[PDB]
């Protein structure tokens, strides 16, 4: 019923569609009252975009190669930032008064509708530079003005990391110092590198994890799951697999509530 508010997420391919399918499912499992609107680039296949059409309410399409797209001019200035400019379209969703953006490599462990309590660019302190906001999970408020300002910054100064985190951190520098309510508890955007890098804190504050963020090169969908053993392909130490539950809970959710939807639509 909360038609005014949404969780948003970005799928740039079929690979990150499986991520989004799991994220979306996890939000449903923890009984969000809020609409889950994905954003899909043209690159997502028609067959996959029907599965994303079942689970997620509105697969709003953002393409930065089309000359009608608002970001197209910017892309011609910054051709390396296609993904970033696509993500920034989250601010164009003016049908919603407030949204939570979540990268497709996140997984929800408990109801986080309380994220909607927080105001514009409330994001977890990023692991590593703890003065930058992990743009994996950020409450945010759609606006054409904000969006245009972000594109301007993208063209004019670009991004330090050549990514969403950089372009957002430069524009919302106030987060680091202005208000503590804008800081989200790390448990709302728990990067696994934190469980690996600083295991002791996780042992103590890990139980309370609300969102896990799968960082590093090898994303959750990439792993191999033997349902018979319920055990993921175990590499040498991988940050995700420091906790054999966070990824297991990804794979289970996939198998239980997606492979059914995927098979039906021909994947």
């Amino acid at each position: 019923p909360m038609t005014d508010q949404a969780f948003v997420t970005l799928t740039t391919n079929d690979a990150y569609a499986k991520g989004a399918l799991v994220l979306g499912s996890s939000l449903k499992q923890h009984r969000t009252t809020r609409r889950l609107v994905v954003l899909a680039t043209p690159q997502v296949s028609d067959s996959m975009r029907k599965v994303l059409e079942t689970v997620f309410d509105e697969v709003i399409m953002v393409d930065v190669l089309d000359s009608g797209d608002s970001a197209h001019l910017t892309l011609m200035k910054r051709p390396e930032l296609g993904v970033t400019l696509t993500k920034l379209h989250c601010w164009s969703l003016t049908q919603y008064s407030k949204c939570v953006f979540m990268d497709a490599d996140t997984l929800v462990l408990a109801n986080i509708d309380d994220l909607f309590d927080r105001e514009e660019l409330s994001a977890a302190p990023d692991p590593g530079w703890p003065d930058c906001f992990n743009s994996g999970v950020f409450v945010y408020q759609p606006s054409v003005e904000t969006y245009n300002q972000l594109l301007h910054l993208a063209s004019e100064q670009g991004s330090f990391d050549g990514g969403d985190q950089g372009i957002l951190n430069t524009f919302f520098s106030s987060w680091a110092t202005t208000d503590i309510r804008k800081h989200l508890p790390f448990i709302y955007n728990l990067s696994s590198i934190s469980i690996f890098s600083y295991l002791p804190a996780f042992k103590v504050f890990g139980a309370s994890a609300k969102v896990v963020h799968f960082l590093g090169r090898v994303k959750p969908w990439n792993y191999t799951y033997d349902p018979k053993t319920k055990s993921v392909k175990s590499e040498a130490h991988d940050p995700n697999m420091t906790h054999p539950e966070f990824l297991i809970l990804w794979w289970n959710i996939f198998t239980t509530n997606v492979l059914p939807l995927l098979q039906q639509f021909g994947l």
């Binding site: 019923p1 909360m2 038609t3 005014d4 499912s25 449903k28 009984r31 009252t33 609409r35 079942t54 689970v55 309410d57 709003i60 089309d66 009608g68 797209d69 608002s70 008064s97 054409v144 509530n257 939807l261 039906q264």
Partner: protein, 601 residues
């Protein structure tokens, strides 16, 4: 015809939340139903935080019996609220939360399977939400009846498919409350139209089960059909919807209850003129440099609503406009037609050309006013002295330059744009593609100019900051050649305003008008017979209608407008209140007739 103890409970998903047109119906039905059922009028609807604060003032129970019910509901892990909706008639509203889904998975859903052999997929939000809503409504009314002294007459009016889970359960739990189920649209109908080649004629032929399954909408269909079968009295919004219901739901509507609107919309002939002026200003701006068209002779035609190319039959309108263009060209007419397609799409901000054109109009107006003011002063001063104005010298060198800049700014350049906002996908836009193909490109030679505004007209917008109602009032004619419209909310609004409106046999409003008016044309509401004609022949029929309107005398058009203002009463709730009252009385009669029996009207 006396409801001694009857309690009316209109259950709908849009009771406090504006998701769709149903919400307008309830908000408007509430006043009239208010009078008939007094304080026994209770609205059961989903809780929305934003909705509740803006629209609802929280209240305490009027009835000690109700207080018990509210308390019991609050106790067992549910967060029901009670309040007075601030809409006309001040109805008491029980807004239950669908966020209290404590045991919904595998307990409420589990129960539903045992009761109705129906299941809801995990992925669907709307169906999942409806099971929560339905179960809660069934519980509420059942608990109310049990905790209160037994009222043999309580009437629960379910107003949509997703409220229908409640009706299924209520009848199944053998609760004595009378149940009315109303389908404002057929779920399968929407998908089958457009989705299939020929939905309307093959109605009987279609195996509903197969089609529903194919679209992964089967659960929703089953719920809608179950609710229809379950209800003692089944109602449909329009006669066309009834035909759909007969074949798709496999149940004839017991009664057909048309939707209605308020009469509060409005010499009062200022508005057609004031609004036309505002519209005329936009046209001047948009078409700057190609203003050879007589701007008093120009007629404005518009199609509005949501964006559906097939459903709202924008294609039929566009094809018909091309034929009208040909007719106007071949037979020379001072009159020019400007067609406004005010259908919302995803687009960028106002196109450079459009914005510049409006700016140039502003500049020209500003220059004219400043020079006019200076002429005013110099004329007044000259007259005061007692001398002739001397028009040649009245305008100073300074104004001559300002005007020279103005005339330069209004350079003809390229042909004016067809779309006010640049579309995200201009290439593939169903409208724009057709406009290009049909040949309407706003060329100087063309007598028909198409202006597509892809944003709902609003006061906030810089260009044409006109509220939809005001824009509608300004236009000469409204063309809504709808294919699937179950009820035409858009055409209805237009007619209540007094704008003559094309409707179709396939639109519910069209069918309603045919049934209620012996000649559609005379009263200004044209009917296109799209049900019994082929697509091309229908287009030709529209062209004939459009052309007839164009060739109407100025005086004749005025008469036509005044005639439409009489047709508002047909759509007023006063008159349309009869049909639903009939449905409610029929409900009481159908089951447990002994207490109250009423013979048919």
């Amino acid at each position: 015809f006396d409801l001694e103890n009857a309690v009316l409970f209109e259950v709908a998903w849009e009771v406090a939340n504006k998701v769709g047109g149903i919400y307008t119906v309830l908000q408007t039905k509430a006043k009239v139903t208010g009078d008939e059922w007094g304080d026994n009028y209770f609205l059961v609807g989903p809780y929305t935080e934003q909705g509740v604060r803006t629209q609802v003032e929280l209240l305490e129970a009027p009835t000690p019996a109700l207080k018990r019910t509210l308390d019991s509901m609050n106790s067992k892990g549910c967060k029901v609220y009670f309040g007075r909706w601030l809409i006309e008639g001040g109805p008491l509203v029980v807004l239950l939360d669908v966020g209290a889904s404590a045991w919904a998975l595998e307990r409420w859903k589990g129960e539903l399977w045992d009761t109705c052999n129906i299941g809801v997929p995990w992925y669907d939000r709307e169906a999942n939400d409806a099971v929560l809503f339905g179960f809660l409504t069934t519980w509420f009314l059942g608990e109310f009846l049990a905790q209160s002294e037994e009222k043999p007459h309580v009437v629960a009016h379910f107003h949509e498919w997703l409220a229908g889970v409640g009706l299924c359960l209520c009848r199944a739990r053998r609760l004595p409350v009378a149940t009315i189920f109303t389908t404002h649209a057929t779920l399968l109908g929407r998908y089958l139209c457009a989705g299939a080649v020929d939905f309307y004629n093959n109605l009987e032929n279609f195996n509903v089960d197969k089609e529903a399954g194919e679209r992964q909408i089967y659960h929703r269909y089953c719920m809608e059909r179950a609710a229809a079968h379950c209800a003692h009295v089944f109602t449909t919004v329009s006669q066309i919807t009834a035909i759909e219901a007969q074949h798709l739901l496999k149940r004839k509507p017991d009664i057909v209850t048309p939707n209605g609107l308020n009469v509060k919309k409005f010499e009062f002939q200022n508005l057609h003129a004031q609004s036309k002026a505002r519209i005329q200003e936009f046209v001047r701006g948009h078409f700057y440099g190609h203003l050879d068209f007589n701007l008093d002779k120009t007629l404005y035609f518009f199609i509005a609503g949501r964006y559906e190319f097939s459903n709202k039959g924008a294609d039929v309108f566009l094809e018909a406009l091309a034929r009208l263009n040909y007719l106007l060209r071949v037979n020379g007419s001072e009159q020019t037609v400007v067609a406004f397609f005010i259908m919302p799409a995803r687009t960028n901000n106002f196109n450079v050309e459009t914005l510049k054109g409006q700016a140039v109009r502003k500049q020209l107006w500003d220059t004219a006013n400043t020079v006019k003011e200076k002429f005013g002063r110099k004329l007044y001063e000259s007259l005061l002295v007692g001398s002739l104005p001397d028009m040649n010298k009245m305008l100073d060198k300074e104004d001559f330059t300002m005007m020279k800049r103005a005339i330069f700014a209004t350079q003809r350049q390229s042909f004016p744009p067809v779309c006010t906002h640049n579309m995200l996908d201009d290439s593939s836009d169903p409208i724009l593609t057709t406009i290009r193909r049909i040949g309407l490109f706003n060329s100087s030679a063309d007598r028909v100019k198409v202006i597509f505004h892809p944003e709902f007209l609003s006061s906030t917008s810089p260009l044409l900051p006109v509220d939809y109602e005001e824009f509608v009032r300004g236009c000469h004619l409204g063309v809504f050649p709808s294919y699937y419209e179950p009820w035409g909310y858009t055409p209805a609004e237009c007619t209540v305003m007094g704008i003559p409106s094309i409707s179709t046999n396939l639109s519910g409003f069209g069918c309603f008008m045919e049934e209620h008016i012996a000649d559609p044309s005379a009263y200004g509401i044209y009917i296109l017979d799209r049900r019994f004609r082929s697509l091309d022949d229908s287009c030709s029929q529209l062209t004939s209608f459009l052309y007839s309107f164009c060739q109407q005398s100025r005086r004749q058009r005025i008469i036509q407008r005044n005639r439409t203002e009489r047709l508002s009463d047909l759509l007023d709730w006063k008159y349309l209140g009869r049909y639903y009252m009939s449905a409610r009385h029929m409900a009481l009669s159908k089951a447990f007739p002994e207490h109250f029996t009423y013979e048919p009207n």
